[PDB]
Amino acid sequence: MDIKYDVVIVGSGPIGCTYARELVGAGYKVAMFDIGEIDSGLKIGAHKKNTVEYQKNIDKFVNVIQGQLMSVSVPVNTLVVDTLSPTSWQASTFFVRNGSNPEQDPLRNLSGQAVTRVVGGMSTHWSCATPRFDREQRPLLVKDDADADDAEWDRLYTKAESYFQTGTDQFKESIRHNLVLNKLTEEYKGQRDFQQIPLAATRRSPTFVEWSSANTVFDLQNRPNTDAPEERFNLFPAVACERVVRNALNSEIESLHIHDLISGDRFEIKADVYVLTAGAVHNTQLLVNSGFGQLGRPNPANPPELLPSLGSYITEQSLVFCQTVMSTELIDSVKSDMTIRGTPGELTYSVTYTPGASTNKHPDWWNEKVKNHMMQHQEDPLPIPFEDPEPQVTTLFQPSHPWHTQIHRDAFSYGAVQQSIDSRLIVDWRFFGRTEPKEENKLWFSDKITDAYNMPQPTFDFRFPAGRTSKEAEDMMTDMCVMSAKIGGFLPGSLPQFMEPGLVLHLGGTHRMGFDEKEDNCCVNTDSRVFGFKNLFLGGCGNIPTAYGANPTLTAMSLAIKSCEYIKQNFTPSPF
Amino acid sequence: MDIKYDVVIVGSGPIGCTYARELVGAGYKVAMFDIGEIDSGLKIGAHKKNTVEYQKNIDKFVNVIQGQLMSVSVPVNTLVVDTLSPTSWQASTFFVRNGSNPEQDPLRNLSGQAVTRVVGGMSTHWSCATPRFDREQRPLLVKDDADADDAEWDRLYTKAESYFQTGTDQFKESIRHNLVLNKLTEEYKGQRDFQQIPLAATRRSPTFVEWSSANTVFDLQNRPNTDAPEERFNLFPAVACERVVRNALNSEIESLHIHDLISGDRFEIKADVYVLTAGAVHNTQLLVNSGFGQLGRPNPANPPELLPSLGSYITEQSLVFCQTVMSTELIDSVKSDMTIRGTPGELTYSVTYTPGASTNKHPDWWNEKVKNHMMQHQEDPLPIPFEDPEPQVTTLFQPSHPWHTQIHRDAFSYGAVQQSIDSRLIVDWRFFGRTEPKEENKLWFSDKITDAYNMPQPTFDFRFPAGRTSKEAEDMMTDMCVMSAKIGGFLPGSLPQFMEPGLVLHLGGTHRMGFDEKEDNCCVNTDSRVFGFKNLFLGGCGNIPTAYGANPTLTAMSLAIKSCEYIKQNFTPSPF
Amino acid sequence: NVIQGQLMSVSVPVNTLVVDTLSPTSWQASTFFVRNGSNPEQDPLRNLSGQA
Amino acid sequence: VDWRFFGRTEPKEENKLWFSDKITDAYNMPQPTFDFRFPAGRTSKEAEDMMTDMCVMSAKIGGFLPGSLPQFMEPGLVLHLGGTHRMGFDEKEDNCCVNTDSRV
Numbered sequence A, B: 001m002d003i004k005y006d007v008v009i010v011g012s013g014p015i016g017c018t019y020a021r022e023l024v025g026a027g028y029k030v031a032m033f034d035i036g037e038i039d040s041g042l043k044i045g046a047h048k049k050n051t052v053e054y055q056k057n058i059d060k061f062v063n064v065i066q067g068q069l070m071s072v073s074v075p076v077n078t079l080v081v082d083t084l085s086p087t088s089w090q091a092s093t094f095f096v097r098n099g100s101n102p103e104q105d106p107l108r109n110l111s112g113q114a115v116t117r118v119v120g121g122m123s124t125h126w127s128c129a130t131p132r133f134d135r136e137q138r139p140l141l142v143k144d145d146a147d148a149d150d151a152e153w154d155r156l157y158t159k160a161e162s163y164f165q166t167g168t169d170q171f172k173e174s175i176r177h178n179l180v181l182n183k184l185t186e187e188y189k190g191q192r193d194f195q196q197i198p199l200a201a202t203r204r205s206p207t208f209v210e211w212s213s214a215n216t217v218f219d220l221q222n223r224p225n226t227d228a229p230e231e232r233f234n235l236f237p238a239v240a241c242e243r244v245v246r247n248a249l250n251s252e253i254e255s256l257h258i259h260d261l262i263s264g265d266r267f268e269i270k271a272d273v274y275v276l277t278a279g280a281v282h283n284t285q286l287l288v289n290s291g292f293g294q295l296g297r298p299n300p301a302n303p304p305e306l307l308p309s310l311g312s313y314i315t316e317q318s319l320v321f322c323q324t325v326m327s328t329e330l331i332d333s334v335k336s337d338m339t340i341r342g343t344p345g346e347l348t349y350s351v352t353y354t355p356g357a358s359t360n361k362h363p364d365w366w367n368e369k370v371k372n373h374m375m376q377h378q379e380d381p382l383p384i385p386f387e388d389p390e391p392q393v394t395t396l397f398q399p400s401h402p403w404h405t406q407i408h409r410d411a412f413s414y415g416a417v418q419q420s421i422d423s424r425l426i427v428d429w430r431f432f433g434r435t436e437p438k439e440e441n442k443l444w445f446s447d448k449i450t451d452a453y454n455m456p457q458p459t460f461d462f463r464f465p466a467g468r469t470s471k472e473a474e475d476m477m478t479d480m481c482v483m484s485a486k487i488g489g490f491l492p493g494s495l496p497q498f499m500e501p502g503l504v505l506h507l508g509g510t511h512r513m514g515f516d517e518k519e520d521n522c523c524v525n526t527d528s529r530v531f532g533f534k535n536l537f538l539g540g541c542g543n544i545p546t547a548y549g550a551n552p553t554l555t556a557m558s559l560a561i562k563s564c565e566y567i568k569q570n571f572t573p574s575p576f
Numbered sequence C: 001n002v003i004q005g006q007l008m009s010v011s012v013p014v015n016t017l018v019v020d021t022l023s024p025t026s027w028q029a030s031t032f033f034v035r036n037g038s039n040p041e042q043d044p045l046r047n048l049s050g051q052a
Numbered sequence D: 001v002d003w004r005f006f007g008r009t010e011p012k013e014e015n016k017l018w019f020s021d022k023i024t025d026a027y028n029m030p031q032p033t034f035d036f037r038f039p040a041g042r043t044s045k046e047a048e049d050m051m052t053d054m055c056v057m058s059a060k061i062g063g064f065l066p067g068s069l070p071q072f073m074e075p076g077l078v079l080h081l082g083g084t085h086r087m088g089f090d091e092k093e094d095n096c097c098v099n100t101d102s103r104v
């Protein structure tokens, strides 16, 4: 440890990694701190699902994800356990047990909200969907010139797309994917258009996909190194960053207070530039622990000195979920171009097709795969090959259907634990609603209760806003029922449902961007700079100030890119 | 990738790491292959629990374990799903889905048996309990001289405990440890002896324990390297080892066929010496895949050419489990030495004790921690400090109580604790029985069904033998019920039960050790060398041929140390 | 089933289960109010919950 | 085979059945409320020892049926409630409501 750097970044998620990639690239002397540790393998902050073993038993990855999702606010438990033996110690009240938060109203929570403390953050487990927002979902970066605003967003997203290696091709030879894609495409007759979900991934072989992650944006190795002899970067894992120190006029940050979790020691790290990328919840915790916003249960009577919008206007998407079992009609269509004779399991059985025939419903590569599966595996009653990659279908958000869709299979902290229905038949349905930012929806911090790292305990006061948010969420549920039925019936055990609020982990707005602090009720400008402070920047979904349905990380990356432009324009890196 | 080494080890679990530490240290050019990958952090093959965030969120580690336990043999599923939509594809038979094994009788399974494929193997997640076996549990290493046999086993165990860093004091200043330790010592005074579980672990601070793993045995760094400039070792993860190539005469291994899972390429690796440490299941798979024992369903009309006892006489332990809620009486005694004035919350609440007082029931270190807790947390109704380390108590196997016991808390694939009862109150009880080896209990491999790595699918034909094994298992359940009652009543939701067969993961006997192949119905001699073959050795629980109740790894490590002593004497390292 | 059909619980405390997966359009409680014949006098931790 | 073991409970003043003066039942009569815990002391010790006896005795006949593991039943489900209007010789001395002819 140096005590002095050009830039310090808190958190080694994919958004901290954007700031590192831009600024280490540009010659700045950079340090990054993470409260979490390198576990992930020799590629630091890489995607934990890039093992052969995981992609051969993908269902087990759900557990890995649950293992690193730590709930943000758990209300005090009031379950009645009245069958303890009379000799066992028995409680008289629902007292504060097992890390629970007595500030939390159980009926106004984001009970599903959780955080991950490891190097690379949530990008070590995420499902890698990186779509662009359309205008209706996107903050403005220029007003009163939509063409200029469009050109800015296109440049930034394009760059963000390179950093993540976003693509729409990785699943193009999957039979399940094309079976679902083509059917929805036919059914909607141009009313909606379908495509592959844009994924941050590169395919390495037919049975393996290198999913992207932080490591993809920046490899997190210390520099200088032989591969980058003129760059300067140090990562410090197991370091809780607790507060930034403000000067007296509140126009500059003077240091970052840290706590080394292994030695126990504390330090004050000095930098020219301080970047907070600790996630939407923890950025806000760190600012409020620093004297920004208001500590404790909200109280209009003593309105804060600084950032009165911090932790208000928060948004989290509604999420509806089901699983379907492929229709007979679609399964039989897999084999539409085949001539099948005799009885499976006899030497006289055969399966053929005519290559190139203009009337075939499917291409040759598909019929080849089907033929070989059905000829080599005559004991199997399905025409889909055993290792056919998953579907990855979306029709993106549009004003007349204002929700994102994913019609796919991926690993999440829920999603079928079942064995009785063949996995080749099962398609997941996830529709994501947009939520209006409302002042009364808040993330705040207890002035009494603390979390496991002795910081102010986060507390939500959240409900989906009535009016348009709620009308679309229900219309969205209906849309998913109507759409999914074109492909098949619901899988028993995964019937259509709203999921636990915040499970979807797309919280935004906690330290929101806009042009004017007051008129826009916001915390950072379009450079991601905290209002008032020359040298403090926030990055993450917490910046997004709009109601969005699409998955937000790519948009948050784009914002961080723009932020790094302003930093190059106003700070000089130290000589090497 | 040299094509030639002095020694090749298949398997990077603790036992393979024993051969490595011994043979790399003695100057052999050693290569090690593992089908799985470095994930675990920069300490290769280290315990995954050793993170600050896991040890602050220890209930989450259960998910990590679940995520890397892949079931060995899952029988064909016969659950009825009769609530599909009539449009959905629906089965006509219970056909083979999702990885199930049609050879498996579901009533003669070890359905809880599971394998872990990652660098370090199961040692990246185990709960670190390493006791010694008494004579009753233990194979003989010296014939006709009980005292020389004990001398040899003491020398081996001593070395193996040093490699694991085994100890019996890391939990000595736990209040809950001592609370239970003391009560049971007193209840069984003159009848049974209680102590701490011998644990491969080193305490680093009052709230942090460095659990041991394969990494403790050997750090798995490629050599030569700065701190060992003269040693030669290379680790190759993501390599499936598939066959050892027998010479026509069956007197020697000529090479190791491997499949690099990243490139897809297959290779023959050459060594002087071949060591299989792939675990009890997968060592056996590999051998049967190489022509040893008999491929397919057992058919005694066909004695196999080699190792007719391979995959017979398998043993797995009966495992009984419950959890308890500490008695009111015990919880009160925790604060027995305390002088209390007024009540909590009120102005003059004070809690004090007199160190050294002869009327004190507890030591000063206990009282100090209780006093401080009760004074610093007057809202909490219990006297146990929040970060009190876990309890870790055992009464070891004896003739009059022939089962191992563990009266503790730790993370397993089951037994995750709920949220309504305070965790400070909860104690886990696991009692492990011993299983008589019997020729009819078998692990065998399909001649046609293959697993996810296209190797012969493992199938169990297993039942707990009638007689002593069965009577003892039931007596063991009653003992748990009687012993647990001294400490507290059963926790609702963790009532006393037998756990699913094999969930215990202490599988033994699959490639069992003895003096004479024929007379003792075994596969390896006491040097762990395969009968007939000059240069093939097996390591692991599968070598153990007795009925044992205590946890096996430490015993397996001892036999490997003995195995290395043979190898050192009989093969010469190549020149550096 | 017949027995269950004629055993009517004597005292049911106020329900404090959290149902947070209702549709946003559905009417949602702000409190754990007296619902369905529950008894608000009853301390759920000092009951004979099974008396009928 | 079903195993049911039934323990005795010491009569204590503080264990009560009472009636709300506001809340009413389905028949518009005052809502019954309990305030009960198994008494500390002999009741509780006996109850636990009783669970142990069942685990010990039952084992002579057979193992537990999975899904019917030994447990304490939700309080009152046994339906053997007593002493709500208790008998004794003398109302004050024996803390009671009826004499031994069951007259109030």
Ligand SMILES: *Cc1cc2c(cc1C)nc1c(=O)[nH]c(=O)nc-1n2C[C@H](O)[C@H](O)[C@H](O)COP(=O)(O)OP(=O)(O)OC[C@H]1O[C@@H](n2cnc3c(N)ncnc32)[C@H](O)[C@@H]1O
Pocket (backbone or CB within 6 Å): A010, A011, A012, A013, A014, A015, A016, A033, A034, A035, A036, A065, A116, A117, A118, A119, A120, A121, A122, A123, A125, A126, A127, A128, A129, A130, A239, A240, A241, A242, A277, A278, A279, A280, A282, A283, A286, A411, A412, A413, A505, A539, A540, A541, A551, A552, A553, A554
């Ligand atoms: C869990 C997950 C998330 C996810 C997803 C599926 C799952 C199961 N699917 C996604 C998808 O397909 N696409 C989408 O856009 N996003 C999806 N997500 C969400 C995504 O992972 C997050 O939006 C993204 O990772 C946010 O990145 P950011 O870099 O802002 O935040 P992070 O990854 O959470 O990293 C923050 C880190 O900072 C640390 N930290 C926290 N507090 C401190 C303090 N006080 N001091 C120092 N470091 C701190 C963390 O430990 C962490 O690494």
Ligand SMILES: *Cc1cc2c(cc1C)nc1c(=O)[nH]c(=O)nc-1n2C[C@H](O)[C@H](O)[C@H](O)COP(=O)(O)OP(=O)(O)OC[C@H]1O[C@@H](n2cnc3c(N)ncnc32)[C@H](O)[C@@H]1O
Pocket (backbone or CB within 6 Å): B010, B011, B012, B013, B014, B015, B016, B033, B034, B035, B036, B065, B116, B117, B118, B119, B120, B121, B122, B123, B125, B126, B127, B128, B129, B130, B239, B240, B241, B242, B277, B278, B279, B280, B282, B283, B286, B411, B412, B413, B505, B539, B540, B541, B551, B552, B553, B554
């Ligand atoms: C899971 C578990 C284990 C466990 C424990 C609690 C949990 C939840 N508690 C333990 C305890 O407290 N004390 C005890 O003695 N045992 C405990 N266990 C079991 C213990 O972990 C194992 O007994 C021990 O790890 C076994 O050692 P070993 O070195 O023999 O084997 P392994 O750890 O299973 O690793 C073998 C490896 O080899 C690989 N592999 C397998 N097949 C191949 C092929 N074909 N080619 C190349 N490599 C192969 C693996 O990937 C693996 O890492």
